[PDB]
From a paper:
A virtually identical catalytic Asp-His-Ser triad was also found in rhamno­galacturonan acetylesterase (RGAE) and the esterase catalysis is assumed to follow a similar mechanism. Analysis of the structure of RGAE and comparison with structurally related enzymes led to the initial characterization of the SGNH-hydrolase family, which is now defined as a superfamily in SCOP. The structure of RGAE from Aspergillus aculeatus is known in two different crystal systems: a trigonal form and an orthorhombic form to very high (1.12 Å) resolution. An extremely low-field signal (at approximately 18 p.p.m.) in the 1H NMR spectrum of rhamnogalacturonan acetylesterase (RGAE) shows the presence of a short strong hydrogen bond in the structure.
In order to examine this hypothesis, a variant of RGAE was prepared in which the catalytic negatively charged Asp was replaced with an Asn. The crystal structure of RGAE D192N was determined to 1.33 Å resolution and refined to an R value of 11.6% for all data. The structure is virtually identical to the high-resolution (1.12 Å) structure of the wild-type enzyme except for the interactions involving the mutation and a disordered loop. The short Asp–His hydrogen bond observed in the wild type is not present and the corresponding distance between Asn192 and His195 is approximately 0.8 Å longer. As in wild-type RGAE, the imidazole group of His195 is hydrogen bonded to Ser9 (2.73 Å), whereas a hydrogen bond to a water molecule (2.79 Å) has replaced the hydrogen bond to Asp192. In RGAE D192N an acetate ion is bound in a similar position, with an O atom occupying the oxyanion hole almost in the same position as the O atom of the sulfate ion in wild-type RGAE. One loop (Gly77–Thr81) was poorly defined in the electron density of RGAE D192N. It is evident from the crystal packing that this loop cannot be in the same conformation as observed in the structure of the wild type and the disorder is most likely to be a result of differences in crystal packing and not a consequence of the D192N mutation. An analysis of the packing of RGAE D192N revealed that contacts involving Glu residues 94, 202 and 206 are similar to those of the trigonal wild-type form. Based on the structure of the D192N variant and the corresponding 1H NMR spectra we could rule out this active-site hydrogen bond as the sole origin of these signals, as the 18.2 p.p.m. signal persists in the spectra of RGAE D192N despite the mutation and the absence of the 14 p.p.m. signal in RGAE D192N.
Author numbering: 1 to 78, 81 to 233
Write the structure that this text describes.
Amino acid sequence: TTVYLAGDSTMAKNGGGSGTNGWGEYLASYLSATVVNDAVAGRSARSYTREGRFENIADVVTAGDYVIVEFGHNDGGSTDNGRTDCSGTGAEVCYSVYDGVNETILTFPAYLENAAKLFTAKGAKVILSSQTPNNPWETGTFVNSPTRFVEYAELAAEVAGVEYVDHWSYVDSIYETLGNATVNSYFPINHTHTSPAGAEVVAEAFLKAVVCTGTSLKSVLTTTSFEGTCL
Ligand SMILES: *[C@@H]1O[C@H](CO)[C@@H](O)[C@H](O)[C@H]1NC(C)=O
Ligand SMILES: *[C@@H]1O[C@H](CO)[C@@H](O)[C@H](O)[C@H]1NC(C)=O
């Protein structure tokens, strides 16, 4: 069995550079399944789609494999940076001339739904996961400030008939517990990329979420002992 990962610098091997790492690098150790980390720094649901990266996974996935999809950090606005999705949750389309093409730009849920349907057709088990939080201790006071993309991932899961993991909430829960000095130490570059220790915390919070939510992936866990509490 193989688990394919789609995401951005918070998930990717080597993170955002300069010493950081992504959470997808801290899963293999706890799964009986091979992990293929196809996350890439800087990508949004739109640009990951446009770059053919969901299609790349689709073309190698085998029946019974899993695909975990987690975007949002790069999906918001600000002229066309090649990443911003069209606003909304449905069938809205936005047109933009980007890299010499009049591009048809979809909403964040449509991109996720379309990828999910593609993987389901190939026999894969798709897990849509809400984005991780930017450092919630940046101000010295804990702030839980979900982006619109958190619930949009849940919406997408429901429309596509696939599983949802609220990775956001499990990360912010353990960050609240770990506290100000510890969590600030996980963000040496900007408030998004994580140090290796933070990437591991973030991965362990995904695994906690799987145990607590009863996600299908629990079947390939080799332990259920992860820090934090069920939410
Ligand atoms: C882009 O394509 C759409 C859909 O056909 C069309 O309305 C729009 O005018 C085109 N835009 C540009 C700037 O060519
Ligand atoms: C929070 O942690 C940062 C980094 O160690 C520290 O510089 C700041 O003073 C701490 N904030 C307070 C409110 O303790």
